[PDB]
């Protein structure tokens, strides 16, 4: 288990360790060496998801390691609640940026292993403050340099907890 401690609340996140192996190791490694502290959700599309964990405050660009391959070819759709990394066109370049789908997204979806049917790879879902989520998708946004859809006030990911105990989301 995982939380994001924002402020606008708690995001709980289980991870799909055994259907994304490498992308939740990854995920983990980045979370381990405080990556995702004082990151913010700077892109943020009503209707479509919010996706983080690549900037600081004033649009900062933290320092990533090597990508990891797309494990999308899972069987997991971007459905609403799911996490997803973020990548460019090339599918195995995600490195630590991911999403949270605010509705089924399909068009994301694997539909092959290809250029452009690899899609977007599901490694984790939210099981507790998707109220949070569903604040967070609504506040104001505006331009930053070569960002769109940043919010105005920053939305920051104050800390991460992350937990290998016995947990109750089962």
Known sequence: MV?????????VIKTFDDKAPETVKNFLD???????????????????????GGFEPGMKQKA???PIKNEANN???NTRGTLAMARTQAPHSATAQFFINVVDNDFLNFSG???????????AEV???????????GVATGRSGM????????????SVTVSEHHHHHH
């Open 3 to 11: 939380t994001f401690h924002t402020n606008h609340g708690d995001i």
């Open 30 to 52: 980045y979370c381990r060496e405080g990556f995702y502290n004082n990151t913010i959700f700077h892109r943020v599309i009503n209707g479509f998801m919010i996706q983080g």
């Open 64 to 66: 990533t390691k090597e």
């Open 75 to 77: 069987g997991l759709k």
């Open 127 to 137: 099981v507790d403050g998707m109220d949070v989520v569903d604040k967070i998708k």
């Open 113 to 123: 292993e290809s250029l452009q049917g690899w899609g977007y790879c599901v490694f």
């Open 147 to 158: 960002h769109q859809d940043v919010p105005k006030e920053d939305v920051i990911i104050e």
